Amino acid sequence: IQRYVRKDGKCNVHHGNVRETYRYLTDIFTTLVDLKWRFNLLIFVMVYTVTWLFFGMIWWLIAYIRGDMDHIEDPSWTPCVTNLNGFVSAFLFSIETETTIGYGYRVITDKCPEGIILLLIQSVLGSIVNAFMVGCMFVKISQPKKRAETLVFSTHAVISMRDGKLCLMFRVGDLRNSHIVEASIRAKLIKSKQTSEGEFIPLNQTDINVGYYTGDDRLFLVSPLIISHEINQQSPFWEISKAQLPKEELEIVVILEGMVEATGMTCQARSSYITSEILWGYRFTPVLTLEDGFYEVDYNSFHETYETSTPSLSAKELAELANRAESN
Amino acid sequence: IQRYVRKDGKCNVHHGNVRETYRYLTDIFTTLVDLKWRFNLLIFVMVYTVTWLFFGMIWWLIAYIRGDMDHIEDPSWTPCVTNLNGFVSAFLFSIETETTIGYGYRVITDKCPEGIILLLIQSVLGSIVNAFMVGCMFVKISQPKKRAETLVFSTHAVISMRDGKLCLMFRVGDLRNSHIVEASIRAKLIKSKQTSEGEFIPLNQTDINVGYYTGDDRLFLVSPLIISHEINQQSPFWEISKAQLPKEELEIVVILEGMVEATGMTCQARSSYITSEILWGYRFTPVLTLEDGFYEVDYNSFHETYETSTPSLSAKELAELANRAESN
Amino acid sequence: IQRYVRKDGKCNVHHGNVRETYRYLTDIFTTLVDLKWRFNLLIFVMVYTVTWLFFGMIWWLIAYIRGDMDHIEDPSWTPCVTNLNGFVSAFLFSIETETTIGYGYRVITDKCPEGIILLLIQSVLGSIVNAFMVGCMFVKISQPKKRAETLVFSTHAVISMRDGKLCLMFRVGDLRNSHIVEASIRAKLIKSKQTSEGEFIPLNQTDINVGYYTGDDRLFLVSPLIISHEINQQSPFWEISKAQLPKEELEIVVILEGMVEATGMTCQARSSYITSEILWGYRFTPVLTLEDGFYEVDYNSFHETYETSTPSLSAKELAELANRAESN
Amino acid sequence: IQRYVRKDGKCNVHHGNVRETYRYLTDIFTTLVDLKWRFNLLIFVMVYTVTWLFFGMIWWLIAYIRGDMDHIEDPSWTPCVTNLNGFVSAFLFSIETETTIGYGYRVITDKCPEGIILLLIQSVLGSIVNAFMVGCMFVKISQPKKRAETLVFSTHAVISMRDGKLCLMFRVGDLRNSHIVEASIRAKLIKSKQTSEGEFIPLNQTDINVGYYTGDDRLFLVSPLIISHEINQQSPFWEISKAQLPKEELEIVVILEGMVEATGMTCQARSSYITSEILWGYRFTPVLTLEDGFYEVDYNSFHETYETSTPSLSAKELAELANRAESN
Ligand SMILES: CC(C)CCC[C@@H](C)[C@H]1CC[C@H]2[C@@H]3CC=C4C[C@@H](OC(=O)CCC(=O)O)CC[C@]4(C)[C@H]3CC[C@]12C
Ligand SMILES: CC(C)CCC[C@@H](C)[C@H]1CC[C@H]2[C@@H]3CC=C4C[C@@H](OC(=O)CCC(=O)O)CC[C@]4(C)[C@H]3CC[C@]12C
Ligand SMILES: CC(C)CCC[C@@H](C)[C@H]1CC[C@H]2[C@@H]3CC=C4C[C@@H](OC(=O)CCC(=O)O)CC[C@]4(C)[C@H]3CC[C@]12C
Ligand SMILES: CC(C)CCC[C@@H](C)[C@H]1CC[C@H]2[C@@H]3CC=C4C[C@@H](OC(=O)CCC(=O)O)CC[C@]4(C)[C@H]3CC[C@]12C
Ligand SMILES: [K+]
Ligand SMILES: [K+]
Ligand SMILES: [K+]
Ligand SMILES: [K+]
Ligand SMILES: [K+]
Ligand SMILES: [K+]
Ligand SMILES: [K+]
Ligand SMILES: [K+]
Ligand SMILES: [K+]
Ligand SMILES: [K+]
Ligand SMILES: [K+]
Ligand code: NA
Ligand code: NA
Ligand code: NA
Ligand code: NA
């Protein structure tokens, strides 16, 4: 069914029917960084080609006007530029001058004013377009989101008993020897609902408690961790039976944010579970082993889960039964 | 009337009558980045032109003193620099040397000491001014605040009933396929007040509760969201009637902060509502539709709002009426 | 007296008698950025001068060995490099080759192997030292802390009554048209104390409540603000009389942190008050004026304060008197 | 014994048996930055050498085909490139063209089409590989984690009485004249445990209270500080006797995070204590001295600790004894 979030992070939403599009041209840098590579290269070449052509054109015009083309065959009458007759020669000179190569077969002289004022503008413009092009490139190459490709989440989550408390649990793990600095995790329930006055809301978001009160969510991630949300009176699962579970339609979205270690940027990873991944009455398998002063991880059992024994009642019923017993 | 915040973000304040102005010259980089473009280009050219002129001047002087100008017509007596007689020639040589072009029609020799010690200084100075100029440029081009141009807020907000609770609501939406990482929202009331001892305060700021206690304000922004503040005993709207609303003079300022996804910088967007946008007894229109495994947004109804039925009493009165009823 | 913090931010502490100094050479970049300018320039020149000399030396040796110096006067017998006889010539060639100038009066040939393998190493080394030198420079030029030079604090703070509550107040203001993103403020009391078992502590730090509970400290800074800490049962001023104030010895340190708007870095400003700035029974003067759709700030009255009437008793006494009255 | 964290920060964990390895090739930048230097230099040279060879090859082919090698000895018949006959000549020309040197002994002409379209591609490719190589280098040189080398922690921590409260204390200090902006500290207990249903957990993490509730953990670090966790009913040390301490097996991990001052990146330092560093009944030695308007630190007594008198009972027993006494 429609998930609203794919199992890897991509979201299923189509922004359509926008009127004010000039906004895209106001922050041209972000639109430039968001495009694919096939287009970035195209724009790069086009800009560099247009800038070179325009300045070659200006050079050719400044030459023709001066009248150098009418005295190409003459020892005296020093011209503006040396060995510059054809249209191609000017293009070559412009390329050789802007990229800072300067072979030296065709050189500028000191008896042609306004050549200096053209060279100045060309040199400045070339230095301005270089940083803008190279900065865009670097920015696009070194973005942080790619790190989220190596932050493994877990399979279908589980619901089980723990110290007389019903809990919902899932697993998260890393995949490198570096560190995620200042990591943190949160989780939201998405499920349509209707108010008591008539209003209908397509999709409602509600936070789930994972340790935001006791500061227990700022996790220290080295080995695979198991996150667990306890079911209490404030949780949206306060009244859910083992048989009533498949009859509902909801979704759980989990988000993990942190900072890369090499650079200092922020990265984010997402995941979701719909209804067919909430397995009732199971446990995860241990993955840590101790060998000669080291701890070995398996990663072959990262998703493996086994079965156990668990009551089949809503936590509200569990409380009543307990309370009554205590009283009597 | 005076809003103290324009409907798009600009603030109406004039900082005047400052004495210690040298502070502006202590952090010259920020003042350089804050200026417009028309001036940045001017400064760029002026600096580059002055640096080139000064070094050309030094070259011309070092030459004249040596006495090369007195033996321009002589095969022997190797000079300091080749083909360097006029003042223009030195300027050309300085340009060609600092920007790293080096045509080769005029070259340095190896029988003129102190030429090396001048070339060293020139090369270092040129490399120091290049990074400072290019870094300023890049910094100014790639700033994050421009992203705030594509973060749409909503029109006049609404006040309506919800599950027997009076609530104040407004709407926020995105405009791209990227993500705002670690987003968050807050809101402040601005309204003049007089203490109980005589002191008068021009403008007072007071926070409004939007979910700071339960961690419900760290929103996950994909589709247009509706933010809602519940009116309870702690809210500054505890005693406000439908007829008494237009008789007051206040303002609500809303702020949203986050991190761009491409880079790792922070961006902020603001908005305000004065008194003529607090519409009593209305609702927003749904904007989500489901089509063939995708969710389509409209954005043509983003501002559209319709009317409904709602009591006309202050929440304090609503409580009393309820309490009394329950009792009896 | 010894303040432990100067009125502008500098701290009076001397780190002495360190044994393991090699730590400074482990993070050589921070030590490089922390030095003054006079030394940075020196290191820059020395590195560039040593790198050029070493490679010129290698070139001169590779030439002498080949035996080119023994056939300087010969048309045939193509040498390794052209016009390279003296020691100075090699230095010039190395400079011209590493900085990417390439005049062309002395050129490499294609009949001298190992010249390519030297040019490769030279080109790579030069490109590696260039980014390291230019990056250090840029980093040092564009640091954020300089912004703290334009974040004005206030003069001696005040203590006064407000709605039957004793409060301690001071003032903070900006000095630009930009914005401080995600600003926040905190304050600590520093005062020596002796436990009840014998231990003596030189200087003790204790936080002061300024709005950390209700999220009221995340301020929105446009015009000069007045920060106010209410004196309640949990404040270290619970028992302090008007006459007993000058008899104590304490200090208050205030800290404000935020993010610059142009870049995305973090900046911090500090200030302190000792005992002679806590003025009892005063108020600040308004600074805002309204003129033709704008709000004008004065900044000539930013420090001006006037006098008023206030009881002279500790807040504990104020409570007792009130309680007793209410009872009777 | 196995510590799970070394006394300096390195962690003892071996990630093994991974199946999907292509993930490493999806975020090639992080893998490039994570390697050692010995390999980075190797990759740098290999890339630069391959790029130069390929383009030299293309040049040699474009020349041979044109038929220039068959008319090397002819005054007329202008060729494509000048003085380009052997395979080495093309390599030299490619090097001289891509690195922007341009000696000028061998030059391009204006009667050989497709030379421009080759030069364009070469120039663009060279500018794209330059920023990618130099950016990687700079990124690797200027990383923040190195600062953690100069953030001294303390030796074995202590447990002692303070105002009738049992507390656990340790020490932290800096080592420079700069500042750590927005510092903060946290601490976790690691110790295996078995639930009440059969499940066994290898290593369990549980937060320890250090001031997260009153905002007292956001420390202002100038001189050596002493962090102290009070033992109350909610602490995992609620039932631990002086004799029962060595009989347990646990570990305490301490983490400190902040922002460097020069740049704006985030740094993190870690440390651990196992069981043999929890010394019962001791105190630290003062390290501050006052001299002529300055505060001198010693750093020779940073680890020195002395002995004192303290009861030997669990805090639970201390409470009972007190309660009983009060009652009677
Ligand atoms: C060799 C590099 C350093 C410089 C020159 C490379 C470009 C001239 C080439 C490389 C791949 C080519 C692209 C391959 C992909 C396409 C898609 C192709 O067909 C489509 O656009 C279908 C719709 C779509 O692809 O989105 C149109 C040409 C184009 C843009 C090509 C544009 C020219 C590109 C970018
Ligand atoms: C072509 C580029 C790469 C290099 C050279 C461009 C500059 C020489 C030109 C471009 C626009 C010109 C500016 C256009 C705007 C103005 C405003 C004009 O009148 C005013 O200043 C009125 C008050 C105001 O504009 O704020 C004075 C000249 C000036 C600064 C001009 C300065 C010279 C500028 C920056
Ligand atoms: C012109 C620039 C682009 C390149 C060459 C500049 C340097 C050669 C000059 C500029 C100022 C000179 C410095 C001026 C200050 C001093 C302090 C002077 O006396 C002291 O050191 C006293 C103690 C102290 O200054 O801390 C010693 C020389 C030195 C380092 C000089 C070193 C050489 C410096 C950096
Ligand atoms: C002089 C610089 C600017 C350019 C050329 C330097 C490289 C050619 C040299 C410098 C040190 C050499 C390395 C020294 C270390 C080694 C380890 C050596 O033996 C091993 O690999 C054992 C296992 C291990 O080292 O991890 C293999 C060669 C290699 C990679 C060498 C590769 C070539 C290196 C990087
Ligand atoms: K950052
Ligand atoms: K950053
Ligand atoms: K050249
Ligand atoms: K060059
Ligand atoms: K040349
Ligand atoms: K030449
Ligand atoms: K941050
Ligand atoms: K060049
Ligand atoms: K950069
Ligand atoms: K933060
Ligand atoms: K909190
Ligand atoms: Na890891
Ligand atoms: Na979006
Ligand atoms: Na401001
Ligand atoms: Na310090």
Side-chain angles (χ1 to χ4, degrees), chain D residues 7-33 35-42:
Chain D
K7 192 66 137 213
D8 66 50
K10 309 303 298 191
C11 315
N12 307 347
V13 157
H14 282 146
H15 293 270
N17 200 330
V18 190
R19 304 198 40 77
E20 294 170 348
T21 66
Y22 65 99
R23 286 185 194 270
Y24 286 37
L25 291 178
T26 322
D27 52 10
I28 294 169
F29 193 77
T30 318
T31 63
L32 238 222
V33 176
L35 294 185
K36 302 150 165 252
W37 280 99
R38 74 197 30 192
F39 299 96
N40 262 19
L41 305 186
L42 220 106

Side-chain angles (χ1 to χ4, degrees), chain B residues 192-195 198 200-203, chain C residues 283 286 306:
Chain B
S192 77
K193 94 165 180 188
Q194 175 166 3
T195 57
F200 179 77
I201 300 89
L203 299 144
Chain C
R283 294 179 181 183
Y306 70 85

Side-chain angles (χ1 to χ4, degrees), chain B residues 59 62-63 66 68 78-82 107-113 115:
Chain B
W59 276 112
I62 280 320
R66 192 199 182 80
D68 289 345
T78 68
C80 191
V81 176
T82 71
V107 187
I108 200 181
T109 189
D110 67 280
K111 275 165 198 220
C112 179

Side-chain angles (χ1 to χ4, degrees), chain A residues 30 83 108 129 146 179 192 201 233 246 257 259 274 315 321:
Chain A
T30 318
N83 314 267
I108 200 181
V129 61
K146 282 303 188 182
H179 286 292
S192 77
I201 300 89
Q233 191 157 6
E257 279 144 12
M259 302 195 174
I274 302 168
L321 273 262

